Write an enzyme that holds these catalytic residues in place. Sequence first.
Site, PDB file in Angstrom:
ATOM      1  N   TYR B 508       0.864  -1.169   0.000  1.00 24.29           N
ATOM      2  CA  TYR B 508       0.000   0.000   0.000  1.00 24.29           C
ATOM      3  C   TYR B 508       0.906   1.225   0.000  1.00 24.29           C
ATOM      4  O   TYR B 508       0.978   1.944  -0.998  1.00 24.29           O
ATOM      5  CB  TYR B 508      -0.980   0.005   1.179  1.00 24.29           C
ATOM      6  CG  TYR B 508      -1.892   1.206   1.137  1.00 24.29           C
ATOM      7  CD1 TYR B 508      -1.589   2.354   1.874  1.00 24.29           C
ATOM      8  CD2 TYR B 508      -3.031   1.223   0.317  1.00 24.29           C
ATOM      9  CE1 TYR B 508      -2.387   3.488   1.829  1.00 24.29           C
ATOM     10  CE2 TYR B 508      -3.849   2.360   0.257  1.00 24.29           C
ATOM     11  CZ  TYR B 508      -3.511   3.498   1.025  1.00 24.29           C
ATOM     12  OH  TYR B 508      -4.304   4.639   0.995  1.00 24.29           O
ATOM     13  N   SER B 591      -5.040   0.793  -5.480  1.00 27.23           N
ATOM     14  CA  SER B 591      -5.129   2.225  -5.218  1.00 27.23           C
ATOM     15  C   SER B 591      -3.722   2.813  -5.180  1.00 27.23           C
ATOM     16  O   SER B 591      -2.989   2.713  -6.166  1.00 27.23           O
ATOM     17  CB  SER B 591      -5.861   2.442  -3.890  1.00 27.23           C
ATOM     18  OG  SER B 591      -6.519   3.684  -3.863  1.00 27.23           O
ATOM     19  N   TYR B 592      -3.337   3.405  -4.050  1.00 29.11           N
ATOM     20  CA  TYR B 592      -1.965   3.899  -3.856  1.00 29.11           C
ATOM     21  C   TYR B 592      -0.953   2.754  -3.978  1.00 29.11           C
ATOM     22  O   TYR B 592       0.137   2.913  -4.534  1.00 29.11           O
ATOM     23  CB  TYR B 592      -1.809   4.576  -2.493  1.00 29.11           C
ATOM     24  CG  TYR B 592      -0.613   5.493  -2.426  1.00 29.11           C
ATOM     25  CD1 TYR B 592      -0.770   6.872  -2.505  1.00 29.11           C
ATOM     26  CD2 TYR B 592       0.676   4.986  -2.303  1.00 29.11           C
ATOM     27  CE1 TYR B 592       0.318   7.729  -2.471  1.00 29.11           C
ATOM     28  CE2 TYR B 592       1.773   5.834  -2.255  1.00 29.11           C
ATOM     29  CZ  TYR B 592       1.584   7.210  -2.348  1.00 29.11           C
ATOM     30  OH  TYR B 592       2.664   8.057  -2.306  1.00 29.11           O
ATOM     31  N   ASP B 669     -14.939   4.018 -11.735  1.00 28.32           N
ATOM     32  CA  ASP B 669     -14.235   4.450 -10.536  1.00 28.32           C
ATOM     33  C   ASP B 669     -14.358   5.974 -10.392  1.00 28.32           C
ATOM     34  O   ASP B 669     -13.738   6.734 -11.141  1.00 28.32           O
ATOM     35  CB  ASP B 669     -12.772   4.044 -10.673  1.00 28.32           C
ATOM     36  CG  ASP B 669     -12.030   4.018  -9.353  1.00 28.32           C
ATOM     37  OD1 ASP B 669     -11.296   3.018  -9.123  1.00 28.32           O
ATOM     38  OD2 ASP B 669     -12.154   4.997  -8.573  1.00 28.32           O
ATOM     39  N   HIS B 701     -13.993   1.915  -7.279  1.00 30.21           N
ATOM     40  CA  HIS B 701     -12.705   1.740  -6.635  1.00 30.21           C
ATOM     41  C   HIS B 701     -12.626   0.499  -5.756  1.00 30.21           C
ATOM     42  O   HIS B 701     -11.545  -0.045  -5.535  1.00 30.21           O
ATOM     43  CB  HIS B 701     -12.371   2.976  -5.827  1.00 30.21           C
ATOM     44  CG  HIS B 701     -10.919   3.135  -5.560  1.00 30.21           C
ATOM     45  ND1 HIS B 701     -10.000   3.352  -6.564  1.00 30.21           N
ATOM     46  CD2 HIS B 701     -10.220   3.113  -4.405  1.00 30.21           C
ATOM     47  CE1 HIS B 701      -8.793   3.461  -6.035  1.00 30.21           C
ATOM     48  NE2 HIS B 701      -8.901   3.320  -4.725  1.00 30.21           N
TER      49      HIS B 701
HETATM   50  C1  LIG Z   1      -9.594   3.843   4.131  1.00 26.55           C
HETATM   51  C2  LIG Z   1      -9.460   3.647   2.632  1.00 26.55           C
HETATM   52  C3  LIG Z   1      -9.095   4.964   1.986  1.00 26.55           C
HETATM   53  N1  LIG Z   1      -9.529   6.097   2.581  1.00 26.55           N
HETATM   54  C4  LIG Z   1      -9.249   7.325   2.111  1.00 26.55           C
HETATM   55  C5  LIG Z   1      -9.790   8.510   2.882  1.00 26.55           C
HETATM   56  C6  LIG Z   1      -8.937   8.865   4.108  1.00 26.55           C
HETATM   57  C7  LIG Z   1      -7.475   9.033   3.739  1.00 26.55           C
HETATM   58  C8  LIG Z   1      -9.428  10.198   4.648  1.00 26.55           C
HETATM   59  C9  LIG Z   1      -9.014   7.832   5.222  1.00 26.55           C
HETATM   60  C10 LIG Z   1      -8.497   7.453   0.956  1.00 26.55           C
HETATM   61  C11 LIG Z   1      -8.196   8.834   0.405  1.00 26.55           C
HETATM   62  N2  LIG Z   1      -8.764   8.977  -0.924  1.00 26.55           N
HETATM   63  C12 LIG Z   1      -8.028   6.309   0.311  1.00 26.55           C
HETATM   64  C13 LIG Z   1      -7.234   6.484  -0.944  1.00 26.55           C
HETATM   65  C14 LIG Z   1      -7.786   6.075  -2.158  1.00 26.55           C
HETATM   66  C15 LIG Z   1      -7.075   6.263  -3.336  1.00 26.55           C
HETATM   67  C16 LIG Z   1      -5.820   6.858  -3.302  1.00 26.55           C
HETATM   68  C17 LIG Z   1      -5.059   7.040  -4.583  1.00 26.55           C
HETATM   69  C18 LIG Z   1      -5.261   7.283  -2.099  1.00 26.55           C
HETATM   70  C19 LIG Z   1      -5.974   7.098  -0.923  1.00 26.55           C
HETATM   71  C20 LIG Z   1      -8.345   5.050   0.817  1.00 26.55           C
HETATM   72  C21 LIG Z   1      -7.828   3.792   0.147  1.00 26.55           C
HETATM   73  C22 LIG Z   1      -8.794   2.982  -0.693  1.00 26.55           C
HETATM   74  O1  LIG Z   1     -10.032   3.023  -0.511  1.00 26.55           O
HETATM   75  O2  LIG Z   1      -8.272   2.248  -1.559  1.00 26.55           O
END
Ligand SMILES: CCc1nc(CC(C)(C)C)c(CN)c(-c2ccc(C)cc2)c1CC(=O)O
Lengths: 733, 727
Positions: B508, B591-592, B669, B701
């Site tokens: 991640y 995702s990330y 997405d 997503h």
């Molecule tokens: C808890 C899961 C989550 N929550 C968040 C929101 C907070 C950081 C406020 C908690 C984010 C912010 N968008 C992500 C996220 C999504 C995409 C990317 C490029 C980066 C970060 C994710 C990850 C996911 O759902 O895959």
Amino acid sequence: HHHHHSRKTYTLTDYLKNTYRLKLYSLRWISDHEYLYKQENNILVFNAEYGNSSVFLENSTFDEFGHSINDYSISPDGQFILLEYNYVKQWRHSYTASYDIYDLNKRQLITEERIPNNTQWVTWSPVGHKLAYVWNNDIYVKIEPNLPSYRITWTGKEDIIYNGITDWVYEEEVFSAYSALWWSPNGTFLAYAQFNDTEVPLIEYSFYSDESLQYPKTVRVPYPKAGAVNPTVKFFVVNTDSLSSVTNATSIQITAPASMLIGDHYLCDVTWATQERISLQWLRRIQNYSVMDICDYDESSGRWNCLVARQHIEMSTTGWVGRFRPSEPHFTLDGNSFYKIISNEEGYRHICYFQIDKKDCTFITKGTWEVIGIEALTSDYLYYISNEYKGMPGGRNLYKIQLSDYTKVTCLSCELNPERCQYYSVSFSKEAKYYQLRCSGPGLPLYTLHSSVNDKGLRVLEDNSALDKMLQNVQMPSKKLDFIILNETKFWYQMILPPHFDKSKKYPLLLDVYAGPCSQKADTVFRLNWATYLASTENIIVASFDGRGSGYQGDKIMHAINRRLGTFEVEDQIEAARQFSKMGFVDNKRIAIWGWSYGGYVTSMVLGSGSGVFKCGIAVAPVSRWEYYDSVYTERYMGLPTPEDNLDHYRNSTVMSRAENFKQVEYLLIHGTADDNVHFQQSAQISKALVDVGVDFQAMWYTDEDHGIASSTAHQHIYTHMSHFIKQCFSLP
Amino acid sequence: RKTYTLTDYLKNTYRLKLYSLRWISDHEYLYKQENNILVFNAEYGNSSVFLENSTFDEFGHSINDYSISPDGQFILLEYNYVKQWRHSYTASYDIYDLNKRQLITEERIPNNTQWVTWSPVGHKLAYVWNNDIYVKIEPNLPSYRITWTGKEDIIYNGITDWVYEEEVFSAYSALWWSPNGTFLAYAQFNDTEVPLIEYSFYSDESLQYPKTVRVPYPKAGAVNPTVKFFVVNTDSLSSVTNATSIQITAPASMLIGDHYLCDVTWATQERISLQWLRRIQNYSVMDICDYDESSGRWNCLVARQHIEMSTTGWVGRFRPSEPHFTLDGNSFYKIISNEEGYRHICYFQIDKKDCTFITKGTWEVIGIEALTSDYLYYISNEYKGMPGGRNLYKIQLSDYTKVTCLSCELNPERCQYYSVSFSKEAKYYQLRCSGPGLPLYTLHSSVNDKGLRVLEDNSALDKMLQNVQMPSKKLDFIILNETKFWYQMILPPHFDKSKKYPLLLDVYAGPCSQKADTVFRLNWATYLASTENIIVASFDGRGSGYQGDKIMHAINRRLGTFEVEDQIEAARQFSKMGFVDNKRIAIWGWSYGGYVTSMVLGSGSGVFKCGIAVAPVSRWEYYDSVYTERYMGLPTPEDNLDHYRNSTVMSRAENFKQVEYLLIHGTADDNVHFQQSAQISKALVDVGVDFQAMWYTDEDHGIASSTAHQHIYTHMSHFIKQCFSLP
Ligand SMILES: CCc1nc(CC(C)(C)C)c(CN)c(-c2ccc(C)cc2)c1CC(=O)O
Ligand SMILES: *[C@@H]1O[C@H](CO)[C@@H](O[C@@H]2O[C@H](CO)[C@@H](O)[C@H](O)[C@H]2NC(C)=O)[C@H](O)[C@H]1NC(C)=O
Ligand SMILES: *[C@@H]1O[C@H](CO)[C@@H](O[C@@H]2O[C@H](CO)[C@@H](O)[C@H](O)[C@H]2NC(C)=O)[C@H](O)[C@H]1NC(C)=O
Ligand SMILES: *[C@@H]1O[C@H](CO)[C@@H](O[C@@H]2O[C@H](CO)[C@@H](O)[C@H](O)[C@H]2NC(C)=O)[C@H](O)[C@H]1NC(C)=O
Ligand SMILES: *[C@@H]1O[C@H](CO)[C@@H](O[C@@H]2O[C@H](CO)[C@@H](O)[C@H](O)[C@H]2NC(C)=O)[C@H](O)[C@H]1NC(C)=O
Ligand SMILES: *[C@@H]1O[C@H](CO)[C@@H](O[C@@H]2O[C@H](CO)[C@@H](O)[C@H](O)[C@H]2NC(C)=O)[C@H](O)[C@H]1NC(C)=O
Ligand SMILES: *[C@H]1O[C@H](CO)[C@@H](O[C@@H]2O[C@H](CO)[C@@H](O)[C@H](O)[C@H]2NC(C)=O)[C@H](O)[C@H]1NC(C)=O
Ligand SMILES: CCc1nc(CC(C)(C)C)c(CN)c(-c2ccc(C)cc2)c1CC(=O)O
Ligand SMILES: *[C@@H]1O[C@H](CO)[C@@H](O)[C@H](O)[C@H]1NC(C)=O
Ligand SMILES: *[C@@H]1O[C@H](CO)[C@@H](O)[C@H](O)[C@H]1NC(C)=O
Ligand SMILES: *[C@@H]1O[C@H](CO)[C@@H](O)[C@H](O)[C@H]1NC(C)=O
Ligand SMILES: *[C@@H]1O[C@H](CO)[C@@H](O)[C@H](O)[C@H]1NC(C)=O
Ligand SMILES: *[C@@H]1O[C@H](CO)[C@@H](O)[C@H](O)[C@H]1NC(C)=O
Ligand SMILES: *[C@@H]1O[C@H](CO)[C@@H](O)[C@H](O)[C@H]1NC(C)=O
């Protein structure tokens, strides 16, 4: 110690990097004795009788110019040349481009009153140097190239009102052209169609573009899917000689017939007969009824008039009229008579001889073969292409028939080079004194020039000896063109056979499928494609088969799938596969099937059939269900998707509904995201369905590619990808 | 002697039992044992059926959720659930009188209501519908309209727009009742000039023409939504005159440019605190605003402003922390970085700048969980110096030196990751231990901190797992430039350390992420380890969370650098541990983690044979402003354009020649747009790299559809097994 045996093969790189080039000969007849060709990127004018190549235009002129000159166009009189640049592709035919005009006598660009940028279409009068261009959906005419344009139409609105250009469907399906302008022979009249897309729904998809673009662009195209509201079409004729600098131009309207105007109709053919007589062909949305109107310009009127007694009806009880549209008329010089390919009372398409006043014609040709196209008509002879020779539909030859004795018919191309050449095409001079013949197979493409006065051979223009030399110690595949009999009927297949083919061995087999209405996959043409690589390098046999629904063999075969897509043509691909293995050299455990477009649909429908015959298959840009594809193609074969018409079969012929059967087969689904033609939607719905029933398949999208997936890099990628999938599905190391 | 199979994972053969309770009072809580709903008593464990399963049989709809008014007089029924984004959804609503025992039929809540919430006491109701805020003093009376300015996709009163939802408030609602329900506080978002992301929705087969979805969505450097904040008095609403909303404007330090409302917290009955963040997210301000009698307005004494900034990164973990106010509201506690960059609790006094820190150390406070007059309760990763453990601590407000770990020794072997829910006044608390053993749920009284009973112990799960060959979990650290970096491995059963195993690096690695922890999971990795004998490892390198700013802030302004290098480094170290077949090291992530996997494979390091990237970011300009700019700044030449440009996966396309790649992405997405992947694939195509792809029609997503979820994991399994020669 290789002993000069052939150990090279036709590799995938060979195909993708274009190692073995196939030399063409592309001329453009300017007069009746001269044509043009590019040599050093110079353009030479050739005398056809002699050889006189006297440089017409040095390649070094338009670099002072400062833009890449895409294509060009010499004015009929030879006095002016049109330079096309900033060419920006749109659909299959349409595009925008900048133009300039170079005074071929004064050796300078015309810098006054230039043709605007973003011009949609430009066209010379057929004589002299009048211009007709369309910019922002409106027609403009220049009488002299350096004088101001006269605006013809004022009503053009982007995506809604099209003047002198087609919209999406007319371009793709009716006219195979962006252009919707037709000059009269001496260029007095400019006839144009005009399309109204106001209520046609839009296909929207994303265009991601260069990674520069932060926000993907949404492309919106007026595109009528089967059953949706179609564009409407009005038709006009303007007299360009009475154009006025002080008054808007009067465009005279020819309305459709009464029998057309009652419902959704089309304009499917325009053809000038004489300086003052024009012929229209119109189609009902239900495409089994069409009317040719013949219209005369009344001098005292200023208007155009189509007399009901000159209306000619063409219809079919077994299917749709025409191969893909009613056939174009070829008028005798005086305008009073015309020749036309129509289906005879046995469902065979032959040349009929029509009088302007008599309803009934007479067939100048007959038999259980078919006339492909009429190519030229002089006062004594009519020149046409047919697949008559050796009763084999996948061949093409040029014949001339004597207008005064229909029994007197000479084959002009048959005996030329019988072993090398069995698929011809023809380019005639302005008045048919000379013709270039273009042989395409089974041997190497051969380009020859002829005088028609005495039908003697003049010169070999291109014989492809360079490619022939390269191929000597290459293990090329051979073709087998033959037929099998099902229910009393011959059906023709072709096999691209691996070198040193051995009937004892069991080769894996790919079914190269298209199988659409009036398709022909089994022919005499020489090809250097993917199939060539698969046979030569991978020892896969690549086979194709024209079953029920295919073309050039009569209406009994062709109409067999009428109102019934996804049936016999699909069934007949399966039966071919059975027939092939039953021939004794096919490994049953390894039969695959692949198709593009309609071929993708049949591939998918085949894999979905639960037949047990096929191991795997690739579908590229396939149709998934017919409500997704365009009205005029679909409705031609499918009727309307309504309960009171053919909804039942629209529903019964989706690949989606077959998803469960894909469990037995390895599927590769490919589709470009910017496919304006068969939309990514069709594949998105396929994938979803396979997901919904838990079947693993392989997928590939191509960012921003259209129906061609024609980008250099994209083209090379998809073929690499499919080769892997195939080699891996065939356990090829 | 059976193993944990893919089917086991996908079809949920072995379920973790939850004990999801919700408190009602200081000593009662609600549980969903059956279709039934019971009020349990903490004092005894005895209960009584509060709501019989088949009472709303008659209703004729499927009941998605319920909600009791604080005074226990009304139950709100939520049906017609239609999901939108992560938190946001639309529903229909009916209210059931409990004193009478029948549905309300007069002045019903509209269909397609965006949010509903009871006041914190009594039965007042505030809901948002067609982007406007409404209030119902009584559940059967006409509701009063507050806002008349709501507009689809443009003006959001009391609800958040895409970005605020996803990134700022992790919630659809933007409403805040005061402690005793007198005041309604709300936010207004204006997306007027925010560009729209447009993508196709194919929908059901029956849909002839794809629908274009258009969502206001600010990408890095695009025009952001603006925000206004209002407070309306619910007690003095009129059936005649339009309700009159007081505005609390941002502090001058915020109005100077682009900014965000990032926290709303009611301090007392007539005091509310607001936290605003600048667009360049390293400087935030807290206003404390008191209600004023003679003017009916709210004044935020400029002297009472509390600044939180950051000179080495951004403020907060993902946003500045929330305050917790002492009852009198003249003091509050919040988590901030200390001078060592570790996040600890600071006691603030309303009328001065210098907070004093009440915790200290090289570990971090994860959260302030409840505060009483006598004690502060928090969770932190202090126990045994383990960043990836969680324990409940109580701190004695009258002497900070006295700090009891309430959960550390309750079960040292099986439990190292606790979460807590306290009763209304914190007399009781429920512990959720999440690992490393099977989850254990327990109920506790505060006064003496004794345990009362086991609520759920997963003994049912425990039985079943005995005759199935289960993987194990190694949690540990390596040293790198004199620093601990934690990693975890999911080791196949009957693990032999002289045998060489395939290894899949599960990544991640986003900022403040933590992938190495004491949590017990049944997931994909569990199947890969149990059935396919693959070691699946994760690693928290630089940028990872809960280890202080020195580590977290390491990737500040430099995304796709250090966090990417460290995964490669982790992988390199793992392949010197002697039981890792380094012909078969793979990396995957979502995702990330999709971005990192892709950045890793494009590195030409030669360490990784193959990768899967699910919904990857491909370059930062494509992802949203709030999240992206927090770590990257603006994609402009005067800020951080050069690095945005360098950090693209497209730029690394050529190196993919060296690796087997699988790219997967849902076509719908809303978050990381398919674009991101469409751009990656195009780049690979352009350089002649063959790879494998998969889209998911209409998936977002999550790729969360029952069937889609099943499909993707099956697809990936096949890819990994092939890449590893596992038949
Ligand atoms: C808890 C899961 C989550 N929550 C968040 C929101 C907070 C950081 C406020 C908690 C984010 C912010 N968008 C992500 C996220 C999504 C995409 C990317 C490029 C980066 C970060 C994710 C990850 C996911 O759902 O895959
Ligand atoms: C193209 O067709 C549309 C109809 O599809 C024409 O617009 C119509 O105008 C007339 C006169 O006001 C009315 O019958 C309708 O109210 C209109 N229909 C709609 C839906 O627009 C339009 O005039 C045509 N365009 C041109 C210039 O030919
Ligand atoms: C055990 O639990 C039951 C169920 O919660 C208790 O019953 C409730 O007691 C409270 C006492 O404050 C009353 O308010 C309610 O009237 C009771 N329930 C209802 C809904 O009627 C019970 O008192 C508990 N203790 C004992 C000793 O049985
Ligand atoms: C909310 O939506 C439902 C569904 O449309 C409404 O119930 C319908 O009411 C109409 C009258 O307009 C009836 O004809 C239908 O039979 C009802 N449908 C169903 C399935 O119950 C309901 O009244 C709506 N309004 C509110 C405020 O609840
Ligand atoms: C939401 O913000 C927008 C600014 O983007 C406001 O719209 C502008 O309002 C002013 C004055 O009313 C106009 O003169 C501008 O031309 C508007 N711009 C555009 C493109 O809309 C809008 O007033 C705000 N709305 C609310 C309810 O706060
Ligand atoms: C509450 O405020 C709204 C909007 O400010 C008012 O309703 C509008 O009044 C204008 C006159 O200025 C009318 O032209 C509109 O048609 C009204 N719109 C709507 C949506 O009602 C109104 O003055 C106020 N209503 C009450 C209850 O006092
Ligand atoms: C091609 O060659 C022919 C014949 O050799 C050229 O015609 C000759 O032109 C000259 C003047 O340049 C005359 O004096 C001769 O009488 C012509 N001879 C014949 C037999 O035609 C002809 O000009 C050349 N082609 C072109 C296009 O210039
Ligand atoms: C010559 C190529 C071609 N030309 C045409 C146009 C005419 C019918 C006028 C010839 C069409 C009709 N749209 C197609 C076609 C496209 C999609 C489908 C589902 C079926 C047929 C193709 C084939 C292709 O390239 O896809
Ligand atoms: C076409 O566009 C170019 C670039 O803006 C301009 O310089 C040129 O003059 C234009 N040509 C015409 C004929 O409008
Ligand atoms: C020609 O027609 C258009 C609109 O139909 C009009 O704007 C223009 O002024 C007309 N010109 C003349 C000559 O009247
Ligand atoms: C008859 O009269 C019209 C109208 O004045 C005139 O233009 C012309 O001379 C005649 N028209 C025709 C068509 O013969
Ligand atoms: C044309 O098709 C319609 C509908 O299929 C049918 O009723 C009729 O047989 C056909 N008409 C003609 C002229 O053949
Ligand atoms: C709620 O708060 C308001 C303002 O502080 C106060 O006037 C009112 O009495 C309160 N109600 C209760 C039940 O405390
Ligand atoms: C906040 O960040 C910007 C960009 O990194 C920087 O120029 C500025 O000095 C920082 N301010 C603080 C409070 O550290």
